[PDB]
Every structure is written in structure tokens, then in C-alpha cells.
Amino acid sequence: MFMINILMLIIPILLAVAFLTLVERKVLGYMQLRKGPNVVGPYGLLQPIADAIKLFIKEPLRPATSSASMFILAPIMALGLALTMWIPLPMPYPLINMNLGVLFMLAMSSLAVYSILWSGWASNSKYALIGALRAVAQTISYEVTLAIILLSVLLMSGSFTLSTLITTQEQMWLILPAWPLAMMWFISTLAETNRAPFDLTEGESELVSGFNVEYAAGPFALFFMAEYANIIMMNIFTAILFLGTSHNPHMPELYTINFTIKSLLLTMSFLWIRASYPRFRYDQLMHLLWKNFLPLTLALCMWHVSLPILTSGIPPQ
């Protein structure tokens, strides 16, 4: 019954991306002083099952001046790596016990930009031709802001597995000994996964130009779908790394209860940022990576090399 476990993980998470689109706007609504989806629910709660069927009735045109084998291959690789990344992730037991899987996250988070380079090219001209070339350019630069300060906690964890990442945090909630790194951990995933303040990707992006600009609601229904699957997955990855919960072997039930409550709270912030701050005007977006983000990340890197040595506090492996 291994095969019944995989389907027990793909299917209960497509609701949690469909029941996030509804909480996308109720939370964003009470900031504007207005109620949620009022009339169809009764409380809203039945909105996405009606808002899903309309997309698969509405005619999925292909553009006449488009290519063929590239345009319908990027949504295959969209949902592939958006759902494959959920595998090696402990809660409290992962589906797969990888020896080194923290690196496998970057082995999965690297290839997502190789679909945007397809879809911007595969269909058509200037509103996604050059306008998607400068969306690959922002997402490549925020790995070296990411991969360094992901390594900067592993000097304190001890190894590459994720079971040690819960063992080392039984008494600490490790956001305290590394709180400068925890800041730039947030803004990276806030800009890499193509969200609201650093937003030259989706729809705020000259407010007209996106990679969604050409997909009718047949193939478009996944792009949005798949994408919303990253944003609840960097949140499930931050809260297993910094803000780690407590594991008890005799009681694994109380792990997940105290766990899903925490990833939901960080997921609120991606909604709660969008209702405050304006955009970044593509220069100043990348003007603060090199000049401003990056030299501090090397500074704390040299700090986290020497401090396990000159404390005589080497982590065991």
C-alpha cells in the first residue's frame, strides 16, 4: 500500500491550493473593509468548486502564430516539479528518507525557470518575448542570495539530512542565533517565487505584461494552480528549518497539529505584504541584490565558519 500513500498526498493538497484562492481574497478583503464572497457559499466555502468547472468548459484556443511542441510541454514541467518537490519533506515522517535532500530542494527549485524561458519563447512576440527574458534574469540572481545563506545554517546543523534539522532544534527555535540570515531568507523566497512587491513576473508587471498573457483557461488553469503550489511549499520549508517544532515518537499525532498551524501563519504574510507595498521598478529590484543583499551574506558566511571552531562547539556527524 505504498501506491495508496502517494495518491493520499497529491489529492488532499489540490484542495489546499483551491481553498487558498478563496482565503486569498477574504483576508485581502477585510483589509479594505469589505466582506468575503457573500452570496454563493453560503460563507464563500463552495466558491472554488464552481470557479474550477468554468475554466474547463471555456474554449482553449491555441495562438495561430505559435509553435507546437514547446507550448504544450511547459505546463507538463510546471506541475511536475511543483508536486515532485513535496516528496522528501518530513511531517514528522517523510515519504522518502533521502540521505541528502536539502540539496535536492535546490535540485528542484532550479529547473522551474526553464519553463518560463520556454513559454515566453514558445508562443509569441514582445509582450512575452523580451518581457519574459527579464523574468528569467531576476530568478537566477536570487539563488546566490539563497544558496549561501541556506549553507550558512548547515554549518550549525551538522549534515545534509532533514531528520537532524529537527533534532538540533529541540530547545532553541533557531531563528534566534541567526536572525540576520532569517531576514534575507524571507525576501529571497518573496522574490524568487514571483510575488507581490518584486513583481515583474505575473500581472503587476508593467501591469499588462506576463507569462499568463496568452494562455486561455484550458492550459492557464494549471499555471496558476501549479504556481500556488510553490508558495505553500517554501512556507512548509521555512518552518522545518528555522521555526522547528518538537517531535515525540510515542505521540506523532500532536506533531502535525502543532505544525500545520505554523506554515499557515507564514503563508498569511505573502497575502499580508501585497496589501501594503508598491513595486520595485526593475533596476532597483536587482540594484539591491549585488550592491546591498550580497556582501552581508558573505560576511555572515565567514562568521558562521569561525564561530563553531572558536567556541569548540562542532556539530556532530
Binding site: M172, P177, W179, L307, P308, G313, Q317
Partner: protein, 67 residues
């Protein structure tokens, strides 16, 4: 003879501009930060050092067998 303006009852409301509430600034910050961070590393070396002791016990049970 039924016309508007009252004989009295007025404010007015201000034209002003003020909300400068400070705020715990100016060497108060950078002092709670370092004082919190050094509590973190002090909470290290009591766990990371202690886990290395149990680490050697885990290798110990290996070596006492395997002849």
C-alpha cells in the same frame, strides 16, 4: 426665514500633521539585538557539545561488537 447657519457650535478640526512617537531608538536598538543573539550562541555549546558526547556513545556500541 428658515435658513442654515447656526449661532454657535463649532470646532474646528486641525490642519496639523503629527505622529512622531519614539520608539526605542538610538543605542537602545543594536543593544537588544546583540543581547538576544549572544543568548543564542550561549544556548549553543550546551547542546551541540552535548550531542557530540552521545555521538561517541553511538559509535561505542558498534565497536564493542564486530569481532
Amino acid at each position: 426665514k428658515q435658513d442654515m447657519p447656526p449661532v454657535g457650535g463649532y470646532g474646528p478640526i486641525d490642519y496639523k500633521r503629527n505622529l512622531p512617537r519614539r520608539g526605542l531608538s538610538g543605542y537602545s536598538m543594536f543593544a537588544v539585538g546583540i543581547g538576544a543573539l549572544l543568548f543564542g550562541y550561549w544556548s549553543m555549546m550546551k547542546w551541540n557539545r552535548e550531542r557530540r558526547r552521545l555521538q561517541i556513545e553511538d559509535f561505542e556500541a558498534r565497536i564493542a561488537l564486530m569481532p
